[PDB]
């Protein structure tokens, strides 16, 4: 249960560089556990926002911020997997859209996006390594140079390389 | 198996008062169906962001828009339920959030709200009656009287009556 309702981040965990802010943590069987606590938000002094699920451990880490909360940070590990809430990652754009880091995979017209991380259906040179920070994960439309047209993404259609997609303007 | 993360709004539909827009339909056996064929969008020639399900003739109704889309009306029908994809439901809020109609039901110290609806553990004049078009239902976070707190919600705590709810701004 409700895990998919959470955007995964694997390898990754946070770090608070504000020693203020609250954290809580148990030792769980899976990483459903965590999620279910979490969106019930049940035995948390505060909102759930995004959890950790520590494999090695089998550990969860329930945190009142993702990773776009200031005071906070990103980082790597194997045994770390970045669970975060949808409703508090912004699901609008404000202009162009350079960062927008929701997760709609589809095309305005309704065609499935390509993994930035794959060559196929669509050879192309969007790596996230060459384009760190910019979140070119999973298959998420994006807009890493933050060109006119907002976010798109590589359809999985060989027949149409690319093509934008429908997020709507904060201002409405 | 994804029906949930569809923010329902029952006895409800979409009138789409402008051939611009398509709307696929197909006569299928339950709801479910639906909700997946919009969130796995497959089939689709558009971004499907809300579908209203026929009881009677048992058939969804995908839509390229919701009840927020400048171009269609809600209306009542026992036989309908609107399922908005809560993608395209704004998260954040600007200001005193007076028109947040997301669905976050959690307050800042992650107490799970009351509904409105209900006058337990706690009494109050909140009526959607009373406050038509702020969207006052399940137990949503809302600021029905745009006041300065931002959203809130009466909490399940019976020692806590009201709390405010930690919705973003779009602005951060």
């Known amino acids: 249960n409700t895990i998919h309702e959470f955007k995964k981040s694997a390898k990754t965990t946070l770090i608070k560089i504000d020693p203020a802010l609250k954290i809580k ?42 990773s776009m909360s200031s005071g906070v940070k990103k980082e790597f590990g194997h045994e770390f997997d970045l669970y975060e ?7 609008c754009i404000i202009g162009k859209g350079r960062s927008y880091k929701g997760t709609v995979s589809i095309t305005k017209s ?16 969007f790596l996230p390594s060459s384009y760190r920070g910019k979140d070119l994960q999973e ?6 140079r933050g060109e006119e047209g907002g976010p798109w993404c590589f359809t999985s259609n060989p027949e149409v390389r690319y093509e934008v997609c429908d997020i709507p303007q904060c201002s409405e």
């Open 139 to 144: 298959n998420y439309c994006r807009n890493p």
């Open 85 to 91: 809430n949808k409703d508090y990652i912004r699901n």
């Open 25 to 66: 943590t148990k030792k769980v069987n899976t990483a459903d556990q965590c999620a279910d606590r979490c969106t019930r938000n049940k035995g948390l002094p505060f909102t759930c926002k995004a959890f950790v699920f520590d494999k090695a451990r089998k550990q969860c880490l329930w945190f009142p911020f993702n």
């Open 110 to 125: 309704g065609i499935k996006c390509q993994p930035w991380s794959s060559m196929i259906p669509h050879e192309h040179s």
